[PDB]
Design a protein around this nucleic acid. Structure first.
Lengths: 100, 49, 413, 99, 50, 50
DNA sequence: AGACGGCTGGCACGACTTTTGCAATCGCAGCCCT
DNA sequence: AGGGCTGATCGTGCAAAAGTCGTGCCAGCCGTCT
């Protein structure tokens, strides 16, 4: 089989489309919020607990820029599904599962 | 025999010519095809031993 | 008042327009397609027939034959190597020594390779792995029974008079082979009926591929060539595409997209130029024709491309390659717009133009050419003179029509 | 190259042509069994170069040079009969009309 | 190649028991596929080649 | 599976891959000679959809 | 039986073509070099 | 504090040299008739 690099990311359409969306819980994002993130509309705060916007929080572009001005690069907010890519790249089960 | 076997079809035809009466299972091509279809969609296809 | 070359006098496309018009000079279907792909910008520019029949084409037949034939691992490998490099006609492309070298085995020798090649030749069709020419003929003759008459002389002609018959040296064949006069002809015919290039018989299916770039149709007897309107490339500008380009809000990217729209409008001029030129000049060329082909190829003269360009009246005699790299299809078939141009072949008799008409006259002459030779330069030239073109032996084309000289065309009857 | 009904089938058995016409058609009232040729066109193929092997082949046998590939029609397998009647329609401007 | 084992090399099969079904990694995606595609061309009308 | 001899007339996912090949080209087009941050704004969404 | 014939084409010279081979000056003024 | 210089932008012809085609037509040769 061939391949493709796919610079514009493509999370598995099967992944999280199901009603028991595992990603929608690991990121804990709302289903409509997840739809906006895929639709590149959420602009959700990508990560970082230090910044005022929560590591997993829908961040307004104005709010994201304001938090960036406040704390350097601590404000990260992606509208596209790369937000979810981080939100799962950051969603941790390392001894967190025992706490849960 | 009555399925998609190609290399098994040739072996079986040769055996029937020779009167050997043996079929070689191997693995169906449709199996690897479905594996690819899995790899074609967003999931790797990997079979353990 | 009067005119003068010297006066206070108040242009020529440069760079951008050059590549633009080159898109017209290039073919639109593929030559322009590569550049269009190379663009990579201006985002504001937009039962089941399934059948999978696996034909063997006699290669799998040979494989089943060797597999069903009693053979050892080395014998099967040698047979497979022999079968691998086979030409379409049926003669082996490579030599037996090359087969032994590719085997890469010291035990593999010329004798084993020859035995394998004979066993393969001892399989359908006659002359398998011929390598040497006429091996199909020799195999068919050997397969032919000795009860057939003239078989001995046929084998003599095939084995060593192969050049004698190849030169059609029937007198020399009779003098050297000492075969009976006018009786060796039967042996030569028997040798001829031996399935030359029998392996080419297996190959009978080739895909059909013809691109009508201006499809004139005559099921109704006449129709607009349509310039293959659907196939004509046409980029689409979209308002939402402009919005998405604005989403590419980068100022450098914005300037790039603006200059890209500029060059794309230029290229639109190029494609419109190609299409309008090959539309108007083509309508002019088909004006000579009535109800599709009026008099076949005898409907045009040496075409002045400058004349058609001046007919376009803008790049008047400013020649190019837009109708070139474009072909108009008609009831007979596909013929180029370069073929819509023509050359002078008629020389006297009120003739100074058109090579197709003179060639068609020559073709009608070939319909009644000489039997001992293609219509002699006297015969063909006199036919052309009867046409009044007077192409002369200078056009007498015969060697160009894959016709050899006169005496070499004399052969046994 | 156009495929035309000329009954000129290279590398073919003679008995097949025994029922064909110069047009290539079969005369009305014939018998038919097996895969008997019905309408024999010859699709011309890509032209060859000087091609010394093919040059010698055209010098010895000639007239075919494998230029025409069999574009012929044949009777169906397992359907046999007797030809009742025929018809033909050619694109206007084509005046073969042999048989 | 000895032309006797390379031909024999093509035909082989494993028992392949305990067939598993699991997720994916991009490195494995690169390893499984032989190349990456970038152009929309499939087949041409000029000479009928890949 | 060509239909009339001339045109392959491929269908479905490969045909979809055709448009995806556009994106596959567009990704390469996004890779160089386009601003991926500015481009993927509307491009990446259609990319995920396709 | 050696010379005609007509084929042939090579040898040569004019006439239609025809791709290619040519991108700049404006516009202030500001920023950079002096 | 004074100079320079910069380039944002500036697209459907036609011609240059060169060839290539038209056209004939001269040298040789072998089929022939001598």
């Amino acid at each position: 089989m061939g391949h493709i690099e796919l610079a514009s990311p493509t999370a598995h359409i099967w992944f999280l489309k199901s009603l028991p969306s595992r990603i929608g819980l690991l990121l804990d994002m709302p289903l409509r919020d997840i739809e906006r993130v895929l639709y590149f509309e959420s602009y959700v705060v990508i990560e970082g607990g230090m910044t005022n916007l929560e590591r997993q929080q829908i961040l307004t572009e104005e709010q994201y820029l304001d938090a960036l001005e406040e704390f350097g690069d601590e404000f990260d907010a992606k509208m596209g599904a790369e937000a979810i890519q981080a939100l799962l790249k950051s969603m941790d089960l390392e001894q967190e599962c025992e706490q849960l | 025999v009555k399925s998609d076997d190609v290399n098994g079809r040739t072996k079986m035809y040769k055996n029937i010519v020779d009167g050997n009466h043996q079929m070689e299972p191997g693995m169906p091509e449709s199996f690897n095809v479905l594996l690819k279809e899995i790899r074609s969609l967003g999931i790797n296809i990997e079979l353990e031993d | 008042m009067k005119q003068g070359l010297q006066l206070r006098l108040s242009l020529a496309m440069t760079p951008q327009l050059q590549q633009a018009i080159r898109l017209l000079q290039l073919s639109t279907l593929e030559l322009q397609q590569e550049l269009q792909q190379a663009l990579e910008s201006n985002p504001l520019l937009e039962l089941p027939v399934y059948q999978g029949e696996t034909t063997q084409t006699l290669q799998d037949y040979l494989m089943w034959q060797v597999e069903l034939t009693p053979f050892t691992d080395t014998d099967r490998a040698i047979a497979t190597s022999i079968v691998d490099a086979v030409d379409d006609t049926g003669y082996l492309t490579i030599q037996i020594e090359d087969i032994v070298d590719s085997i890469g085995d010291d035990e593999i020798g010329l004798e084993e390779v020859e035995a394998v090649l004979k066993r393969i030749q001892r399989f359908d069709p006659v002359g398998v792995a011929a390598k040497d020419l006429r091996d199909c003929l020799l195999i068919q003759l050997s397969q032919f029974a000795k009860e057939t008459p003239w078989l001995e002389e046929a084998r003599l002609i095939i084995s060593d008079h192969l050049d004698l018959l190849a030169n059609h040296d029937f007198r020399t064949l009779m003098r050297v082979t000492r075969l009976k006069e006018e009786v060796l002809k039967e042996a030569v015919n028997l040798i001829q009926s031996l399935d030359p290039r029998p392996g080419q018989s297996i190959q009978t299916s080739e895909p059909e591929y013809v691109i009508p770039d201006v499809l004139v149709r005559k099921v109704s007897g006449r129709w607009t060539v349509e310039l293959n309107a659907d196939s004509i490339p046409r980029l689409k500008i979209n308002q939402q595409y402009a919005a998405m380009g604005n989403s590419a809000r980068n100022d450098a990217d914005g300037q790039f997209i603006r200059s890209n729209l500029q060059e794309a409008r230029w290229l639109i001029k190029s494609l419109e130029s190609r299409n309008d030129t090959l539309l108007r000049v083509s309508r002019c060329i088909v004006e000579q024709q009535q109800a599709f082909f009026e008099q076949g190829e005898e409907y045009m003269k040496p075409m002045v491309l400058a004349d058609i360009a001046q007919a376009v009246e803008m790049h008047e005699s400013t020649i190019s390659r837009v109708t070139t790299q474009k072909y108009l299809h008609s009831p007979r078939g596909i013929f180029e717009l370069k073929y819509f141009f023509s050359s002078h072949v008629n020389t006297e008799g009120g003739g100074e133009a058109s090579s197709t008409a003179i060639r068609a006259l020559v073709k009608k002459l070939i319909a009644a050419e000489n039997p001992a030779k293609p219509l002699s330069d006297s015969k063909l030239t006199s036919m052309l003179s009867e046409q009044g073109i007077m192409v002369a032996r200078r056009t007498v084309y015969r060697e160009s029509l894959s016709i050899p000289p006169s005496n070499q065309r004399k052969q046994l009857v | 190259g156009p495929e035309e009904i000329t009954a000129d089938i290279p590398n073919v058995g003679e008995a097949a042509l025994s029922k064909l016409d110069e047009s290539g058609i079969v005369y009305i009232g014939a018998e038919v069994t097996g895969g008997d040729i019905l309408v024999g066109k010859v699709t011309p193929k890509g032209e060859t170069q000087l091609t010394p092997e093919e040059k010698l082949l055209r010098a010895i046998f000639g007239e075919k040079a494998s230029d025409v590939k069999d574009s012929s029609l044949r009777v169906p397998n397992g359907v046999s009969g007797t030809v009742i009647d025929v018809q033909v329609f050619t694109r206007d401007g084509v005046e073969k009309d042999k048989r | 190649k000895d032309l006797l084992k390379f031909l024999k090399a093509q035909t082989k099969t494993e028992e392949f028991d305990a067939i598993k079904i699991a997720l994916a990694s991009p490195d494995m995606i690169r390893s499984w596929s032989f190349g990456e595609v970038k152009k929309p061309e499939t087949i041409n009308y000029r000479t009928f080649k890949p | 599976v060509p239909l009339d001899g001339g045109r392959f007339a491929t269908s479905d996912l490969n045909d979809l891959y055709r448009r995806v090949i556009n994106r596959n080209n567009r990704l390469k087009r996004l890779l160089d000679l386009a601003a991926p941050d500015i481009i993927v704004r509307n491009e990446k969404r259609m990319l995920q959809e396709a």
